[PDB]
Structure 1
């Protein structure tokens, strides 16, 4: 369906944005107080 191809693009973009905003957060926390 066309729907499962237009919705999919926005879902993938949102997932990527969320994941790598989380990556920024983890890098900040590592600089502040590393856990390893």
Structure 2
């Protein structure tokens, strides 16, 4: 199957942005968990 470098560059734009957005959500979840009950 094909996969051109413009398709790869378009996919990378979504894959990075989705990854970072998920890490941002997770960062808020840890901010909430820590303010509720710190683990250190």
Per the shorter chain, which TM-score range? over 0.9
Structure 2 length-normalised TM: 0.86
Structure 1 length-normalised TM: 0.94
Gaps of 5+ in 1: none
Cα distance in 1 for residues equivalent to 2:12 and 2:23: 16
Give the deviation of 1:19 after TM superposition: 0.5
Give the paired residue count. Answer: 36
Question: What is the DSSP-based 3-state SS (H/G/I as helix, E as strand, rest coil) of the residue aligned with 1:35?
Answer: coil
Q: State the Cα RMSD in Å.
A: 0.4
Pick the structure with greater CA Rg.
Answer: 2
